Design a protein around this ligand. Structure first.
Ligand SMILES: NC(=O)c1ccc[n+]([C@@H]2O[C@H](COP(=O)([O-])OP(=O)(O)OC[C@H]3O[C@@H](n4cnc5c(N)ncnc54)[C@H](OP(=O)(O)O)[C@@H]3O)[C@@H](O)[C@H]2O)c1
Ligand SMILES: Nc1ncnc2c1ncn2[C@@H]1O[C@H](COP(=O)(O)O)[C@@H](O)[C@H]1OP(=O)(O)O
Ligand SMILES: O=C(CO)[C@H](O)[C@H](O)COP(=O)(O)O
Lengths: 470, 469
């Protein structure tokens, strides 16, 4: 059983297990190890016909792997992963390649990558999207690390990766050195928060303003998805709106408490954007939208005390349903423009030469945010790899021009009717700000110099200036 | 030469003045600064005063009466760490060290723990009020152990601004370890909000009502007579007056639209994301700062990205009042957000923050000095466990009376292509906060659908998963 296995996996929770099964199905012997043996063993018996190699101790596991050893870690992010890494280090050899496919915070990977390079060991921080089903059938993957070591891992990753239905291209490509992989995966997770919120706002509008029924709302997303929006998330939405309550009358969607899921890791993209000095209103608005929703108890109380308009809709339903559709797409565009500009900045800061156009290609399948318009992002970067912002490319220039009007009315209609659209309003503000040649930042600048002499720059000559306000 | 009663390190704008404040209370004040040149430059001018000029840290530390009371006003982070590292050896059991800068609170929290049982008294304190504040009387936000605090209170009270309504000094005990610096970071957070709300109104007036600086300076004057009466509005019309010192035209037109920022605003937002606190407005103004540094692409994008060039054809004075309401309204949203974060932070760190007091000490020597802070104090006198300020009557009323106007201002400004990030934030927040039901229901449904994440129900307790297949 010594040196038999081509690839190894540590962590036999559903994720690791599924991955090991994925890799096995592509024609490999794969060694599986878990801390709690009864899990490993439990996996072995269910999958004895497969070419999995059962291992009881780290020793057996490391010992079972062909060299250079390719080991994927699918354990709990944080202390656990460092624990696991520390347990393997003695037993490993120079040139062996460790792979962390957990939902890891990028600095963790940047630190680990560097530490282990001193010990000779290669380290590939790799984002694995698509959940348990993807891990088994086809994930989208975002690896980063030593490029030489990755090249030796790439074949497997490429065989197991999800295949884009438009061209069967594997949803995996090298991101860059150290932690570039995990950083791309983060922005991805941020972006997901944006889309989900943007859909939420769309739903909220049709439901509340146009008094639409779930069934009516289903039909709309159904249609919208035939067009340019076309996205798995929209497909999920029309699927969820079909379903009956399993414990009572009506729709499950109307029975699910409006309190959003525990933070969690979704805040990271916004933390990074704050850190790098990058404007990311949309995604950050999405996060707080989640947050504010967890204040349900407070909202109930406020709902009974604070006044809002009690308007009643009289416009044209067909006209508005189409303006919101434009609002949706325009806003979605704003989010990506921001998220792709974040990547561009992080790519300078850390020196990564991030392949922006491929990122979009490898998001086409095996993840949540998969959508037809991702191609337009690739087109854009093909045209100019150095493109500062998605908005400045022929396709998005056009969409924004023909669509901006609708946003505005959607904004006025919602705001007048008192329906909360934090991300829609944000999208249109990012727009008008980005194109504003001059901003009133001049006044802020004056204020800070006035009270604290923080010094400003001038519009007319180069240099640093402090006006004498006293 | 143990002569001096108090000592100030770092003779830039803040440390300089602070040392002059302390001096004006009839003490003799050690002045050290790392760059000798400025220490002598301050001694030489203020000969008349009782300043003890020193050149090495050992001098300065020797030259203080025991127990020594030392207050640092140095640039935050590395700059402050090294300054304190130098100092600790030189000091004696019973001495008092004060970090008066904009230190990121975790630095202080850690420092406090480190320094706790080594017999040196440490205070992390926030100081608001800028140069005039530091000179004449600043807002002070001391945190640390109560015994430490009690030794500096007498002199803090003396140098602190006095509230004009009651003469109560704008300094109080904030809480254990980092409580103080934390409070000041929220001060600066709210500050960025106010400023972006101010700037946006400048824009609206200048760009939709096509108003001149004198016309606008006049508008901010009249506003400061009303309920808006506040330091920031005040310094605005003060700015709008001044003329270029190097050319024709108004100074405020020759400053480049690129906001500098020194961390505190960013830190507030970071803490909000960290605590689960919804802090849209301040975070929107942080990003408003960011996107302003993107001047180059804004210049580029202005020539390619189309937008409304539609003229304003309505009643000017009617729409000016409408903006004033929205400005008042939005300020209230910000402070609500700010205070709720402080609530959450308080219970995270076991601080027991005096919310009412915090409003009280903000009445003066404070950049976010504003008349309507008293109202915040009432609200907390009325119920110290208040969850959000919007629930309090005084504010329930204002929102009810001003919300319709906000909506009109937001509508006009969007249709006129003029960017109002914090204004749009204000009404969104208010509209979310008052909804019994948000579309989080759909979101949750989605999360359970693709990722098995589970969810709560509207009708029964427990966590549930839906067999979506
Ligand atoms: N300005 C305001 O409106 C205001 C308001 C409240 C609080 N604060 C806080 O008060 C503190 C200082 O006030 P400031 O803004 O007037 O000054 P600052 O520019 O932030 O800090 C400069 C002071 O720190 C010293 N310093 C800078 N870098 C150093 C280094 N690397 N090593 C050792 N010393 C160093 C400088 O000495 P050199 O002369 O040698 O450079 C100078 O005395 C800061 O922490 C600031 O956040 C400022
Ligand atoms: N501190 C740790 N040390 C070693 N392995 C761990 C640790 N924490 C979690 N794991 C492993 O990671 C996987 C669980 O990840 P998650 O918590 O994200 O579902 C499991 O295989 C678990 O093994 P075990 O089955 O022995 O607990
Ligand atoms: O603490 C202060 C006032 O409250 C300082 O003036 C501070 O530096 C201003 O904030 P920033 O420079 O980040 O805009």
């Amino acid at each position: 059983h010594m040196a038999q296995a081509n690839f190894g996996v540590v962590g036999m929770a559903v994720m690791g297990k599924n991955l090991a099964l994925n890799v096995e199905s592509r024609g490999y012997t794969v060694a599986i190890y878990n801390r709690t043996t009864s899990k490993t063993e439990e996996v072995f018996k269910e999958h004895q016909d497969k070419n999995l190699v059962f291992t009881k101790t780290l020793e057996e596991f490391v010992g079972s792997l062909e060299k250079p050893r390719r080991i994927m870690l699918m354990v709990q992010a944080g202390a656990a992963t460092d624990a696991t890494i520390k347990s393997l280090l003695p037993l490993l050899d120079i040139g062996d390649i460790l792979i962390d496919g957990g939902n890891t915070h990028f600095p963790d990977t940047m630190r680990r990558n560097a530490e282990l390079a001193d010990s000779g060991i290669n380290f590939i921080g790799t984002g694995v999207s698509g959940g348990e089903k993807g891990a088994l059938l086809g994930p989208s993957m975002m690896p980063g690390g030593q490029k030489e070591a990755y090249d030796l891992v790439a074949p497997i990753f490429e065989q197991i990766a999800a295949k884009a239905p438009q061209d069967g291209k594997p949803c995996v490509a090298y991101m860059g050195a150290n932690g570039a992989g995990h950083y791309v995966k983060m922005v991805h997770n941020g972006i997901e928060y944006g889309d989900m919120q943007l859909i939420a706002e769309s739903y909220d509008l049709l439901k509340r303003i146009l008094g639409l029924s779930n069934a009516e709302i289903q039909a709309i997303f159904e249609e919208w998805n035939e067009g340019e929006l076309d996205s798995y998330l929209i497909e999920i939405t029309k699927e969820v709106l079909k379903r009956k309550d399993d414990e009572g009358e009506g729709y499950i969607v109307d029975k699910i408490l409006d309190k959003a899921g525990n933070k969690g890791t979704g805040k990271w993209t916004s933390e990074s954007a704050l850190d790098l000095g990058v404007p990311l209103p949309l995604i950050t608005e999405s996060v707080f939208a989640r947050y504010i929703s967890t204040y349900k108890d407070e909202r109930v109380k406020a709902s009974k005390v604070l006044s809002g308009p009690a308007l009643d809709f009289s416009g044209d339903k067909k006209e508005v349903i189409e303006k919101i559709r434009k609002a949706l797409y325009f806003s979605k565009i704003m989010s990506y423009a921001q998220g792709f500009a974040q990547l561009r900045k992080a790519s300078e800061e850390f020196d990564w030469d991030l392949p922006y156009g491929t990122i979009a290609q490898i998001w086409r399948a095996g993840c949540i945010i998969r959508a037809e318009f991702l191609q337009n992002i690739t087109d854009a970067f093909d045209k100019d790899s150095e493109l500062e912002n998605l908005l400045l490319d022929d396709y998005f220039v056009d969409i924004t021009k023909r669509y901006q009007e609708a946003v505005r009315d959607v904004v006025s209609l919602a705001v007048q009717a008192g329906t909360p659209i934090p991300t829609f309003t944000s999208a249109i503000s990012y727009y008008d700000s980005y194109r504003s040649e001059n901003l009133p930042a001049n006044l802020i600048q004056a204020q800070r110099d006035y009270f604290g002499a923080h010094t400003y720059e001038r519009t007319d000559k180069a240099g640093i200036f402090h006006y004498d306000w006293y």
